[PDB]
Amino acid sequence: DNFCVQIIGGFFTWTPDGIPTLSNITIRIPRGQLTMIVGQVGCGKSSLLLATLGEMQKVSGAVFWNSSRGPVAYASQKPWLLNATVEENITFESPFNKQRYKMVIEACSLQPDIDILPHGDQTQIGERGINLSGGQRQRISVARALYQQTNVVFLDDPFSALDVHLSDHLMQAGILELLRDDKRTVVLVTHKLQYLPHADWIIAMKDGTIQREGTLKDFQRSECQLFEHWKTLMELEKELSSV
Numbered sequence: 240d241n242f243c244v245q246i247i248g249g250f251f252t253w254t255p256d257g258i259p260t261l262s263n264i265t266i267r268i269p270r271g272q273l274t275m276i277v278g279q280v281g282c283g284k285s286s287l288l289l290a291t292l293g294e295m296q297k298v299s300g301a302v303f304w305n306s307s308r309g310p311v312a313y314a315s316q317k318p319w320l321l322n323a324t325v326e327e328n329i330t331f332e333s334p335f336n337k338q339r340y341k342m343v344i345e346a347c348s349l350q351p352d353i354d355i356l357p358h359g360d361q362t363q364i365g366e367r368g369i370n371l372s373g374g375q376r377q378r379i380s381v382a383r384a385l386y387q388q389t390n391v392v393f394l395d396d397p398f399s400a401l402d403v404h405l406s407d408h409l410m411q412a413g414i415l416e417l418l419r420d421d422k423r424t425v426v427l428v429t430h431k432l433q434y435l436p437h438a439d440w441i442i443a444m445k446d447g448t449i450q451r452e453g454t455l456k457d458f459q460r461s462e463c464q465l466f467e468h469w470k471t472l473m474e475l476e477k478e479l480s481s482v
């Protein structure tokens with residue numbers, strides 16, 4: 240109805256005939272809102288993101304897309320980089336709009352870093368080019384995710400190798416401004432719980448199964464231990480002829 244991705248009792252294994260890495264998956268992602276998946280290391284957040292994309296085989300349950308999935312803007316936990324220039328890494332087979340390109344660059348704070356080095360927004364990077372630092376690779380992948388005119392945006396820990404200032408500016412200018420104005424569906428896996436007030440929907444995962452759902456107000460009563468743990472980790476209220 241008003242939700243983007245629906246899973247009812249989904250079972251997903253990475254191996255073809257192994258133990259279910261994801262068990263009893265139930266997910267109700269709102270459309271046009273920010274949904275944040277939180278959990279410990281290796282509890283299946285990236286696996287949940289890829290299971291919604293069909294990258295994992297399904298043992299049981301059903302997956303519904305009300306957007307026939309359609310395109311999804313995805314920023315992997317390991318930042319993927321093409322062999323082309325920075326401009327083509329950000330546009331990624333899209334029409335080049337200078338206004339949108341500069342807006343996404345200012346949202347990711349990529350301008351002063353592309354000012355460095357032999358070329359500006361035209362250096363070949365990845366293979367057949369100069370290597371970039373992990374923050375630059377991650378933010379170029381995030382800029383590619385933010386650039387495309389896609390209603391669904393999947394972000395898998397954009398703040399893995401980012402400091403406080405760049406991650407905060409990325410969170411505000413990208414997620415709360417560049418993605419809210421066009422009402423794109425943003426699913427944001429993160430280990431930074433300081434952005435939990437900015438979450439319309441929250442997914443809690445624990446050992447390959449999903450613990451809770453809803454807003455922080457729902458976490459206030461049903462799961463008091465997890466709510467107090469979130470409070471302690473950071474009252475959690477929302478918001479040539481010679482040649």
Ligand SMILES: Nc1ncnc2c1ncn2[C@@H]1O[C@H](COP(=O)(O)OP(=O)(O)OP(=O)(O)O)[C@@H](O)[C@H]1O
Nearest residue numbers: 253254260278279280281282283284285286287316
């Ligand atoms: N491509 C893969 N092939 C096989 N097993 C995988 C693969 N990706 C993840 N797994 C397994 O699935 C489980 C959860 O991994 P996943 O990457 O979803 O966790 P995560 O919580 O998102 O990651 P992080 O370690 O960054 O917190 C682990 O047991 C891991 O070994």
